[PDB]
Design an enzyme around this catalytic site. Structure first.
Site, PDB file in Angstrom:
ATOM      1  N   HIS A   1      44.319  50.191  46.596  1.00  0.00           N
ATOM      2  CA  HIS A   1      44.922  48.952  46.106  1.00  0.00           C
ATOM      3  C   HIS A   1      45.746  49.284  44.861  1.00  0.00           C
ATOM      4  O   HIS A   1      46.966  48.887  44.760  1.00  0.00           O
ATOM      5  CB  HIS A   1      43.800  47.946  45.855  1.00  0.00           C
ATOM      6  CG  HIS A   1      43.038  47.609  47.109  1.00  0.00           C
ATOM      7  ND1 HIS A   1      43.626  46.944  48.157  1.00  0.00           N
ATOM      8  CD2 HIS A   1      41.761  47.851  47.490  1.00  0.00           C
ATOM      9  CE1 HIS A   1      42.743  46.747  49.119  1.00  0.00           C
ATOM     10  NE2 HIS A   1      41.610  47.303  48.749  1.00  0.00           N
TER      11      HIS A   1
ATOM     12  N   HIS B   1      43.406  50.091  35.265  1.00  0.00           N
ATOM     13  CA  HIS B   1      44.317  50.231  36.330  1.00  0.00           C
ATOM     14  C   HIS B   1      45.545  49.380  35.998  1.00  0.00           C
ATOM     15  O   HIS B   1      45.561  48.655  35.006  1.00  0.00           O
ATOM     16  CB  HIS B   1      43.731  49.766  37.752  1.00  0.00           C
ATOM     17  CG  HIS B   1      43.312  48.308  37.707  1.00  0.00           C
ATOM     18  ND1 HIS B   1      42.069  47.885  37.208  1.00  0.00           N
ATOM     19  CD2 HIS B   1      44.018  47.180  37.963  1.00  0.00           C
ATOM     20  CE1 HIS B   1      42.051  46.556  37.215  1.00  0.00           C
ATOM     21  NE2 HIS B   1      43.236  46.110  37.639  1.00  0.00           N
TER      22      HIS B   1
ATOM     23  N   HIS C   1      48.993  47.046  37.895  1.00  0.00           N
ATOM     24  CA  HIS C   1      49.698  46.382  38.977  1.00  0.00           C
ATOM     25  C   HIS C   1      51.168  46.566  38.709  1.00  0.00           C
ATOM     26  O   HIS C   1      51.601  46.406  37.554  1.00  0.00           O
ATOM     27  CB  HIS C   1      49.354  44.893  39.061  1.00  0.00           C
ATOM     28  CG  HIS C   1      47.882  44.616  39.097  1.00  0.00           C
ATOM     29  ND1 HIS C   1      47.230  44.402  40.307  1.00  0.00           N
ATOM     30  CD2 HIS C   1      46.912  44.624  38.137  1.00  0.00           C
ATOM     31  CE1 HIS C   1      45.946  44.112  40.049  1.00  0.00           C
ATOM     32  NE2 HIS C   1      45.698  44.348  38.780  1.00  0.00           N
TER      33      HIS C   1
ATOM     34  N   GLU D   1      51.190  40.535  36.970  1.00  0.00           N
ATOM     35  CA  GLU D   1      50.368  39.393  37.526  1.00  0.00           C
ATOM     36  C   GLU D   1      50.506  38.140  36.623  1.00  0.00           C
ATOM     37  O   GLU D   1      50.995  37.114  37.063  1.00  0.00           O
ATOM     38  CB  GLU D   1      48.882  39.847  37.604  1.00  0.00           C
ATOM     39  CG  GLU D   1      48.807  40.990  38.614  1.00  0.00           C
ATOM     40  CD  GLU D   1      47.453  41.188  39.234  1.00  0.00           C
ATOM     41  OE1 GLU D   1      46.443  41.264  38.544  1.00  0.00           O
ATOM     42  OE2 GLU D   1      47.465  41.130  40.513  1.00  0.00           O
TER      43      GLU D   1
ATOM     44  N   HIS E   1      45.416  46.578  33.160  1.00  0.00           N
ATOM     45  CA  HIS E   1      44.167  45.849  32.979  1.00  0.00           C
ATOM     46  C   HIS E   1      43.112  46.855  32.542  1.00  0.00           C
ATOM     47  O   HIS E   1      42.757  47.748  33.343  1.00  0.00           O
ATOM     48  CB  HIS E   1      43.769  45.245  34.307  1.00  0.00           C
ATOM     49  CG  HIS E   1      44.616  44.071  34.641  1.00  0.00           C
ATOM     50  ND1 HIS E   1      44.739  43.627  35.941  1.00  0.00           N
ATOM     51  CD2 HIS E   1      45.437  43.339  33.868  1.00  0.00           C
ATOM     52  CE1 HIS E   1      45.566  42.606  35.960  1.00  0.00           C
ATOM     53  NE2 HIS E   1      46.002  42.386  34.696  1.00  0.00           N
TER      54      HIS E   1
ATOM     55  N   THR F   1      41.565  39.416  39.746  1.00  0.00           N
ATOM     56  CA  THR F   1      42.836  39.106  40.502  1.00  0.00           C
ATOM     57  C   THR F   1      42.895  39.786  41.876  1.00  0.00           C
ATOM     58  O   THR F   1      43.911  39.602  42.563  1.00  0.00           O
ATOM     59  CB  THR F   1      44.062  39.545  39.678  1.00  0.00           C
ATOM     60  OG1 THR F   1      44.100  40.943  39.587  1.00  0.00           O
ATOM     61  CG2 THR F   1      44.121  38.750  38.364  1.00  0.00           C
ATOM     62  N   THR F   2      41.829  40.552  42.225  1.00  0.00           N
ATOM     63  CA  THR F   2      41.707  41.072  43.607  1.00  0.00           C
ATOM     64  C   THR F   2      40.378  40.553  44.164  1.00  0.00           C
ATOM     65  O   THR F   2      39.410  40.298  43.415  1.00  0.00           O
ATOM     66  CB  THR F   2      41.592  42.565  43.648  1.00  0.00           C
ATOM     67  OG1 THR F   2      40.605  42.994  42.727  1.00  0.00           O
ATOM     68  CG2 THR F   2      42.953  43.137  43.216  1.00  0.00           C
TER      69      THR F   2
HETATM   70  C1  LIG Z   1      31.603  42.464  43.055  1.00  0.00           C
HETATM   71  C2  LIG Z   1      32.475  43.618  42.603  1.00  0.00           C
HETATM   72  C3  LIG Z   1      31.790  44.819  42.567  1.00  0.00           C
HETATM   73  C4  LIG Z   1      32.599  45.858  42.187  1.00  0.00           C
HETATM   74  C5  LIG Z   1      31.984  47.233  42.106  1.00  0.00           C
HETATM   75  N1  LIG Z   1      33.921  45.740  41.848  1.00  0.00           N
HETATM   76  C6  LIG Z   1      34.505  44.502  41.842  1.00  0.00           C
HETATM   77  S1  LIG Z   1      36.269  44.629  41.385  1.00  0.00           S
HETATM   78  C7  LIG Z   1      37.558  44.116  40.248  1.00  0.00           C
HETATM   79  C8  LIG Z   1      38.453  43.173  40.747  1.00  0.00           C
HETATM   80  F1  LIG Z   1      38.181  42.720  42.040  1.00  0.00           F
HETATM   81  C9  LIG Z   1      39.554  42.730  39.936  1.00  0.00           C
HETATM   82  F2  LIG Z   1      40.396  41.845  40.415  1.00  0.00           F
HETATM   83  C10 LIG Z   1      39.855  43.240  38.654  1.00  0.00           C
HETATM   84  S2  LIG Z   1      41.185  42.664  37.591  1.00  0.00           S
HETATM   85  N2  LIG Z   1      42.480  43.158  38.407  1.00  0.00           N
HETATM   86  O1  LIG Z   1      41.492  43.510  36.419  1.00  0.00           O
HETATM   87  O2  LIG Z   1      41.348  41.250  37.636  1.00  0.00           O
HETATM   88  C11 LIG Z   1      38.943  44.193  38.203  1.00  0.00           C
HETATM   89  F3  LIG Z   1      39.162  44.646  36.980  1.00  0.00           F
HETATM   90  C12 LIG Z   1      37.834  44.662  38.963  1.00  0.00           C
HETATM   91  F4  LIG Z   1      37.022  45.601  38.445  1.00  0.00           F
HETATM   92  N3  LIG Z   1      33.803  43.405  42.273  1.00  0.00           N
HETATM   93 ZN   LIG Z   2      43.971  44.257  37.708  1.00  0.00          ZN
END
Ligand SMILES: Cc1cc(C)nc(Sc2c(F)c(F)c(S(N)(=O)=O)c(F)c2F)n1
Ligand SMILES: [Zn+2]
Length: 257
Positions: free
Chosen positions: A61, A91, A93, A103, A116, A195-196
């Protein structure tokens, strides 16, 4: 199944993750005129001197630079936060073009990319339990614009060819995330979500007002990554951003002006 295409991109996510249409989803457009200055917001504390990077990973991703979060070594606190949040990974985007990629947007302006830095609240003991909680995460969002290179970004950019495809990882020690921060820590903040998928509503967003600039050569090297695994047809890892979501019943607060 989910991803960023016509058939599995953001407008599809609600079918697997109904919270996509929830009450506190991210990102959002930051309308700078209507954000409320809050003179009681404290300066953000970023304490990254003891950060231990470990690995860099293409998860299909984005790519994550992971840290050792088994002790308080790289922590975010103060700002709008209560207590202490540990850095687990960062990471980005980004876009297929310099005109898009972020985003969050600022008065509908899109930046070329958005970083992020993801942190989880220590009172929940680990990331997996923190994401189930409404104050579980604090994500520090920093916009990237294209212009002069960011020297502190170059080690990340230089390792990308080693994790081109989904599932690849590489050792990534001694990376100092202080090299990715702009001069000012003035921020906006609001309650939102990942956001994912799984899109969980567990994030205090802290978005810095000041973007960092990176070179066109740096962001071009992001665009050479692949969403596919090795030996699968090449799909460039570009436009891995979720568009702005309805603000609903929320107020964005500003630490400044
Ligand atoms: C329930 C679960 C377990 C694990 C290991 N990772 C996640 S993931 C995650 C995510 F889905 C995100 F959208 C984001 S974010 N882009 O910075 O908003 C994130 F930082 C993340 F670390 N969700
Ligand atoms: Zn992110």
């Amino acid at each position: 199944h989910w991803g960023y295409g016509k058939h599995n991109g953001p407008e599809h996510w609600h079918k697997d993750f109904p919270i996509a249409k929830g009450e506190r989803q991210s990102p959002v457009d930051i309308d700078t005129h209507t954000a409320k200055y809050d003179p009681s917001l404290k300066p953000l504390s970023v304490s990254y001197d003891q950060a231990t990077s470990l690995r860099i990973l293409n998860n299909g991703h984005a790519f994550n630079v992971e840290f050792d979060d088994s002790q308080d070594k790289a922590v975010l606190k103060g700002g709008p936060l209560d207590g202490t949040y540990r850095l687990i990974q960062f990471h980005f985007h980004w876009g297929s073009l310099d005109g898009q990629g972020s985003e969050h947007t600022v008065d509908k302006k899109k930046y070329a990319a958005e970083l992020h830095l993801v942190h989880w609240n220590t009172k929940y003991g680990d990331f997996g339990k923190a994401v189930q909680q409404p104050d579980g995460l604090a994500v520090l969002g920093i916009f990237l614009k294209v212009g002069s290179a960011k020297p502190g970004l170059q080690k990340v950019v230089d390792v990308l060819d080693s994790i081109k495809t989904k599932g690849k990882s590489a050792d990534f020690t001694n990376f100092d995330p202080r090299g990715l921060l702009p001069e000012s820590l003035d921020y906006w903040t609001y309650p939102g979500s990942l956001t994912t998928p799984p899109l969980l509503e567990c994030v205090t967003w802290i978005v810095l007002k000041e973007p960092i600039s990176v070179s066109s050569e740096q962001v071009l090297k992001f665009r050479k990554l692949n969403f596919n695994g090795e030996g699968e047809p090449e799909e460039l890892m570009v436009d891995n951003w979720r568009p702005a979501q309805p603000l609903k019943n929320r107020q964005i607060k500003a630490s400044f002006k």
